[PDB]
Amino acid sequence: KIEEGKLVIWINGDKGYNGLAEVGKKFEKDTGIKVTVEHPDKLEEKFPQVAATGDGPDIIFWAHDRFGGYAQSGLLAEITPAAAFQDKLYPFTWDAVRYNGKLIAYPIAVEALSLIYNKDLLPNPPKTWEEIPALDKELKAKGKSALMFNLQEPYFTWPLIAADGGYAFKYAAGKYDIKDVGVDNAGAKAGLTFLVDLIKNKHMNADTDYSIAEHAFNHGETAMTINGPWAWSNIDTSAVNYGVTVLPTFKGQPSKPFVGVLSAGINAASPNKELAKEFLENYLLTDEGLEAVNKDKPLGAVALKSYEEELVKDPRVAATMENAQKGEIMPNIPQMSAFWYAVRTAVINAASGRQTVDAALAAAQTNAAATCSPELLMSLIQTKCADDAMTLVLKKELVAHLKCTITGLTFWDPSCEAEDRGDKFVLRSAYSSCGMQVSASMISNEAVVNILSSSSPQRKKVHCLNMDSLSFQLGLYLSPHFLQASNTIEPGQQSFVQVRVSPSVSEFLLQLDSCHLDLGPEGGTVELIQGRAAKGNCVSLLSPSPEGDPRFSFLLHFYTVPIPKTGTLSCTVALRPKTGSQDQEVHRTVFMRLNIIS
C-alpha cells in the first residue's frame, strides 16, 4: 500500500506542480521529508479506483466537488485544523470542503472561469454573448475567430447554461435535493441552444478541445477564450497582450460559472496524515508557499486571507472574483460525478449534432439523478536468532487462515529464497550473507514477501543481536555495592558478581542461564547457578543494576587446605529483546580468572 515515511502528491497537469514541488523542497530542508509531486491523467477518476485498494497518494489536489463523493465512500480522512488556523482562511472556502459536518480537505484557491481576450486584436471585448456572431464575422474576413474554448468539458459550457437559470441541483431545507435536477429547464435549453447555434452558424467548431483552444489563443488564431487562472502562465510564455474581464452576459443575465475551490484532501489509508497536515498547514498554506505555486502557475484567488488581500490588487484576480461572485459554488454532494458525466454527454451530443438540444438535455436530467489481509501475514513471520545465523520461519497452518498464496519469500538478496519443508517455510542466512546489514550492534535485514493477490512486495524488518559487537566483562564485589577489586576472592566471605556489557544494551533483557566456578584439576567444579535459578543454599540471586546488568551472590566454602590458588568464573548470559520473542534470544558465555586466598 502507500509507502510509509514519504508524502506523495497528485495534482492536475495544468496546475503548477513545479511551484508545488519547490514548496516540498523547502519542506525537505527543514524536516528531511521528501515530497513527490506527480500529475497523472484522470487523477480525479483514478484516485477512487486505487485508493479503495489502499494504494494512492498521501495528498490529492482537486476541486472540492469531487471530495464529497470520495468522503461518502470513505476515501478521505477528516482534517483537524485549529480554530486559529481556520480563521486565516475565508469562511466560504471551509464551507466547500465541509461534508457531513466534517472537514475532509484543506481549501487552497478559489477557481472561476473568466473571459480572456487578445488586447492587440480586440482592445474592448464584447459585453454580451449575443454579439459574438457579429464579432466572429468581422474577424473571419481577417482569417481569425472571435472565441475558442474547450467544448469537451461541460465546466466551460456551464457558465452559458446557468446564465438563464440552468442549475445542477436546487438547494432547499439546507440540503441539495437530488431528485430535483435543473438540466432540462428552459434556462439550460436556452444556453445550450445558443452554443449549438454558434456551431451551426460556423462561429465555433464542435470538436474544439482544451489544448486546441489554448494553442489557438496563444498563437493569435482567436481573439477570445474562456479559461481559468492556471492558463495565464502559458499566455505569458507567449507574447500575447491580453486581459481578463467578466464573462459576457446572456439574455441580459450574467454568466454563472461553477466555482471550484482547489482543495487538498488526505488519503484515508495514508499513514503519514500527521506529515500531510504539518506540510499543508505550516508550509503550503502561507504567504510564501502560495506565492511559490503562483509563480509556476497562477492560482488566482487564494483561500488564505493575508495573501489574498495582495492578490486582489491584481486586475486578473479581481476579474476571477467578479466571475465567482456572479457564479455559484459547486455542490460537493457525491451525485456530482453523475451530473458532470451526464452533462458532458449532452453538450457533446447536442454540439456534435447527434441529438437535438431538447433530446440531449432531457436525457442528461435522467442520468444525473441516477481477502488476503497481508498485514496479518507479516505478523506470522518468526525471526530465529542463532549464534552465527538468522532464520525466518512461517507456519503453513497460520497462512491457511489468511487465505493467501505466497509467491515468494526472500531477504534483500533475491538469491536467498525460502525453502518449503511442507509444514512451514524456512529461510536461513548467515549473518555475513544474503545482504545482511551490520550496524548499531544489530544485524538487520528485511523479509520480502510476494503474494499472488498484490503485485507489490511486502517488506518486514527483521533484526538479530550481534554479540561480537558487544563486550562482556565479569565484575566481582566484596559487598553489595560497587567496588574496584574483582580479581581476588576469599573463602568464607560473601562474594558478589555483576555482568557488565558495553555498549550497555538497555533494550535487551539479560538473564543468567548457567554459572560455574572451575577450580581446575584436583579442585573440581562447583555449580553456582543452573537452569536459570540459583543452585544450593550457598548461592542466591540478587536484583539487577539500574543498568540492565544482572547480579547474583555466592558463598564459597572449602573444607581442606591447600585452597585452589586460581579459579575461573564461567557464566552463560541470555540476551532477548524487550520487544522480541524468545526466538530472538541469544546466548553467550563469559569467562574470568580470579585469585583465591585466605
Ligand X SMILES: OC[C@H]1O[C@H](O[C@H]2[C@H](O)[C@@H](O)[C@@H](O)O[C@@H]2CO)[C@H](O)[C@@H](O)[C@@H]1O
* Site for ligand X, rule CB under 6 A: 12, 14, 44, 63, 65-66, 111, 153-155, 260, 340
Tell me which residue of 223, 213, 215 sits closest to 245, measured CA to CA: 223
- Four-CA torsion 557, 560, 564, 567, nearest 10 degrees: -20
Q: How far is the CB of 351 from ligand X (least distance, A)?
A: 14
User: Residue 357 in 3-state DSSP?
Assistant: helix
For residues 219 and 238, what is the distance between their CA atoms, to the nearest angstrom?
8
The span from the CA of 516 to the CA of 524, in Å, is 11
Q: Which residues of 100-118 are buried (b: 16+ CB within 10 A; e: fewer)?
A: eeebbbbbbbbbbbbbbbb
CB of 393 to ligand X, least distance (A): 50
Strands (DSSP E) contained in 326-388 are 328-329, 382-385
The residue among 154 and 577 lying less far from ligand X, judged by its C-beta, is 154
User: Measured over all CA atoms, what is the biggest interatomic distance in the chain, rounded to whole angstroms?
Assistant: 129
Q: Which residues contact 571 (CB under 8 A, 6 or more apart)?
A: 474, 497, 499, 512, 514, 515, 516, 529, 589, 590
Q: Is 74 left (phi over 0), alpha (psi -120 to 50) or beta?
A: left
Provide the minimum distance between the beta carbon of 68 and ligand X in the complex, in angstroms, as a whole number. 11
Smallest gap, in angstroms, from Cβ of residue 153 to ligand X? 3
* C-beta of residue 524 within 8 angstroms of C-beta of residue 560: no
Give min distance, CB of 97 to ligand X, in A. Answer: 13
Task: Rank residues 44 and 164 by Cβ distance to ligand X and give the closer one.
Answer: 44
DSSP-derived secondary structure letter, 117: E
| CB closer to ligand X, 155 vs 508 | 155
Which residue's CB is nearer to ligand X, number 70 or number 554? 70
Residue 36 Cβ, how far from ligand X at the closest point, in Å?
20
By the 8 A CB rule, do 585 and 576 touch? yes
How far apart are the C-alpha atoms of 300 and 281, rounded to whole Å? 19
For residue 346, the minimal CB distance to ligand X (Å) is 12
Provide the CA 510 distance to its chain's centre, in angstroms: 40
Nearer to ligand X, 218 or 337 (CB): 337
Closer by beta carbon to ligand X, 63 or else 515: 63
CB of 420 to ligand X, least distance (A): 50
Q: Which is nearer to ligand X, 261 or 394 (CB)?
A: 261
Q: How far is the CB of 66 from ligand X (least distance, A)?
A: 5
Strand partners, 244: 116
Nearer to ligand X, 364 or 512 (CB): 364
Which residue from 68, 74, 59, 62 is spatially nearest to 14, judged by alpha carbons? Answer: 62
Query: Hey, what's the cell of 466?
Result: 550481534
Cβ closer to ligand X: 227 or 245?
227
How many whole angstroms separate alpha carbon 549 and alpha carbon 575? Answer: 11
Closer residue to ligand X (CB): 340 or 431:
340
Q: Which is nearer to ligand X, 231 or 569 (CB)?
A: 231
Name the 3-class secondary structure at 465: strand
Residue tagged 514541488 (cell numbers):
21
Minimum distance of ligand X from residue 228's CB (angstroms): 6
CB-based contacts of 566, cutoff 8 Å, min separation 6: 520, 593, 594, 595, 596
Q: Least separation, in Å, of the C-beta of 292 and ligand X?
A: 19
